[PDB]
Design an enzyme around this catalytic site. Sequence first.
Site, PDB file in Angstrom:
ATOM      1  N   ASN A 137       0.798  -1.241   0.000  1.00  0.00           N
ATOM      2  CA  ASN A 137       0.000   0.000   0.000  1.00  0.00           C
ATOM      3  C   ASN A 137       0.826   1.285   0.000  1.00  0.00           C
ATOM      4  OD1 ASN A 137      -2.646  -1.305   0.041  1.00  0.00           O
ATOM      5  ND2 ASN A 137      -2.091  -1.949   2.138  1.00  0.00           N
ATOM      6  N   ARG A 142       7.964   7.038  -1.052  1.00  0.00           N
ATOM      7  CA  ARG A 142       7.786   6.729   0.370  1.00  0.00           C
ATOM      8  C   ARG A 142       8.521   5.465   0.817  1.00  0.00           C
ATOM      9  NH1 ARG A 142       1.768   5.741   1.083  1.00  0.00           N
ATOM     10  NH2 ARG A 142       2.471   5.307   3.243  1.00  0.00           N
ATOM     11  N   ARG A 192       3.326  -1.744   8.872  1.00  0.00           N
ATOM     12  CA  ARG A 192       4.487  -2.441   8.300  1.00  0.00           C
ATOM     13  C   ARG A 192       5.600  -2.673   9.325  1.00  0.00           C
ATOM     14  NH1 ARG A 192       2.104   0.751   3.657  1.00  0.00           N
ATOM     15  NH2 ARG A 192       2.509   2.457   5.113  1.00  0.00           N
ATOM     16  N   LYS A 237       2.913 -12.150  -3.415  1.00  0.00           N
ATOM     17  CA  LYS A 237       3.514 -11.104  -4.238  1.00  0.00           C
ATOM     18  C   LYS A 237       4.914 -10.765  -3.733  1.00  0.00           C
ATOM     19  CE  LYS A 237       4.369  -6.783  -5.790  1.00  0.00           C
ATOM     20  NZ  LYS A 237       4.941  -5.544  -5.194  1.00  0.00           N
ATOM     21  N   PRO A 254       6.124 -11.706  -9.985  1.00  0.00           N
ATOM     22  CA  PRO A 254       5.239 -11.088  -8.989  1.00  0.00           C
ATOM     23  C   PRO A 254       3.948 -10.514  -9.602  1.00  0.00           C
ATOM     24  CG  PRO A 254       7.504 -10.288  -8.745  1.00  0.00           C
ATOM     25  CD  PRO A 254       7.451 -11.056 -10.028  1.00  0.00           C
ATOM     26  N   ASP A 256       0.384  -8.478  -8.686  1.00  0.00           N
ATOM     27  CA  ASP A 256      -0.542  -7.700  -7.857  1.00  0.00           C
ATOM     28  C   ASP A 256      -1.603  -7.124  -8.801  1.00  0.00           C
ATOM     29  OD1 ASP A 256       0.702  -5.508  -9.169  1.00  0.00           O
ATOM     30  OD2 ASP A 256       1.824  -4.882  -7.418  1.00  0.00           O
ATOM     31  N   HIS A 258      -1.950  -4.297 -10.121  1.00  0.00           N
ATOM     32  CA  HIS A 258      -1.339  -3.489 -11.165  1.00  0.00           C
ATOM     33  C   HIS A 258      -0.888  -4.326 -12.361  1.00  0.00           C
ATOM     34  CE1 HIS A 258       2.195  -1.001 -12.731  1.00  0.00           C
ATOM     35  NE2 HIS A 258       1.151  -0.210 -12.912  1.00  0.00           N
ATOM     36  N   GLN A 299       9.147  -9.479 -17.293  1.00  0.00           N
ATOM     37  CA  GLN A 299       8.169  -8.680 -16.565  1.00  0.00           C
ATOM     38  C   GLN A 299       8.785  -7.352 -16.206  1.00  0.00           C
ATOM     39  OE1 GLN A 299       5.841  -7.843 -12.628  1.00  0.00           O
ATOM     40  NE2 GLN A 299       6.274 -10.018 -12.730  1.00  0.00           N
TER      41      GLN A 299
HETATM   42  O1  LIG Z   1       6.374  -3.916  -6.802  1.00  0.00           O
HETATM   43  C1  LIG Z   1       7.374  -3.297  -6.941  1.00  0.00           C
HETATM   44  N1  LIG Z   1       8.373  -3.710  -7.898  1.00  0.00           N
HETATM   45  C2  LIG Z   1       8.201  -4.900  -8.679  1.00  0.00           C
HETATM   46  N2  LIG Z   1       7.243  -5.797  -8.492  1.00  0.00           N
HETATM   47  O2  LIG Z   1       7.405  -6.812  -9.400  1.00  0.00           O
HETATM   48  C3  LIG Z   1       8.500  -6.536 -10.171  1.00  0.00           C
HETATM   49  C4  LIG Z   1       9.022  -5.328  -9.734  1.00  0.00           C
HETATM   50  C5  LIG Z   1      10.269  -4.717 -10.396  1.00  0.00           C
HETATM   51  C6  LIG Z   1      11.157  -5.740 -11.093  1.00  0.00           C
HETATM   52  C7  LIG Z   1      10.413  -6.784 -11.905  1.00  0.00           C
HETATM   53  C8  LIG Z   1       9.123  -7.337 -11.333  1.00  0.00           C
HETATM   54  C9  LIG Z   1       7.655  -2.031  -6.141  1.00  0.00           C
HETATM   55  C10 LIG Z   1       6.902  -1.920  -4.885  1.00  0.00           C
HETATM   56  C11 LIG Z   1       6.110  -0.759  -5.487  1.00  0.00           C
HETATM   57  C12 LIG Z   1       5.137   0.206  -5.376  1.00  0.00           C
HETATM   58  C13 LIG Z   1       4.879   1.075  -6.459  1.00  0.00           C
HETATM   59  C14 LIG Z   1       5.630   0.960  -7.679  1.00  0.00           C
HETATM   60  C15 LIG Z   1       6.628  -0.025  -7.797  1.00  0.00           C
HETATM   61  C16 LIG Z   1       6.880  -0.867  -6.737  1.00  0.00           C
END
Ligand SMILES: O=C(Nc1noc2c1CCCC2)[C@@H]1Cc2ccccc21
Length: 308
Positions: A137, A142, A192, A237, A254, A256, A258, A299
């Site tokens: 979140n 941040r 967290r 994730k 990973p 999520d 998004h 990815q």
């Molecule tokens: O999730 C994040 N990074 C990644 N998750 O999966 C991958 C990455 C980068 C490398 C390949 C695959 C971070 C945590 C958060 C929050 C907002 C924007 C980005 C990110």
Amino acid sequence: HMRHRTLSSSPALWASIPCPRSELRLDLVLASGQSFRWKEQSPAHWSGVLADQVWTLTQTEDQLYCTVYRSQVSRPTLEELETLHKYFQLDVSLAQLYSHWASVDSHFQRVAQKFQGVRLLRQDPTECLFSFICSSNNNIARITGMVERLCQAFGPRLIQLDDVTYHGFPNLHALAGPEAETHLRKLGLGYRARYVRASAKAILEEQGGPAWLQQLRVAPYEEAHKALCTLPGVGAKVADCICLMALDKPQAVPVDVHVWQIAHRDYGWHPKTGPSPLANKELGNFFRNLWGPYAGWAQAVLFSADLR
Ligand SMILES: O=C(Nc1noc2c1CCCC2)[C@@H]1Cc2ccccc21
Ligand code: NI
């Protein structure tokens, strides 16, 4: 007392590594959601902590330049350049991977044209784990703040450059203590903070400390992933993040909400039956099936392209 080096200012302190910009684009890798410890302190000059030392990195079209702040001021040794070589996993040709993925995926072909040199860093499991526990979140700016403050409050001081104090990542014992959650809440981590302290405590007591994380690096992906999901604040994730970025499982993808949005919009993907644990697992399999054993690296190209 000391500043961040640039390439013009201190050129006798910089070693180079022969490395095209199609193998590595620092500006698409270092602040693109993998590590949260790199900052562009001068234009095209990236500074950050690796393993209780500070580096500044910059690159031409053909070369990657490196200087290290440790002591009699030197250029990087052979051993120190080897650790950068490993960090960027430079023994793997990303050019050949880009082609391999491109042959099965027209969409990837288009995006890759623009976003060359996105690769996967090879991170320390401990830094990677607590960084991604902080990522729920949250946003990149941040998370960077929380990780910086955490290192200042809990890890050893290394050096100051300009008005920036650099600290090494804390050991597990330092995040496991009776006041750690309370300190971590004062630093802005919110909920967290419970997970950070709880997971540190659990790796020590329930798994036998950091040798565990090295065992997981050598274990099969699926075994590592399940073992990580036993930790507080670590689900599918975050576990896939750690697997992909710190335990040498390049097939980990990973997923999520998004990634779900992007799979749907750009691949037309729907679960074969909205998000859930089952469906997210299906989407990770979909991409593994499409891209192959380095699906997580593919990815990353798209992930960085989506941050722009
Ligand atoms: O999730 C994040 N990074 C990644 N998750 O999966 C991958 C990455 C980068 C490398 C390949 C695959 C971070 C945590 C958060 C929050 C907002 C924007 C980005 C990110
Ligand atoms: Ni649809």
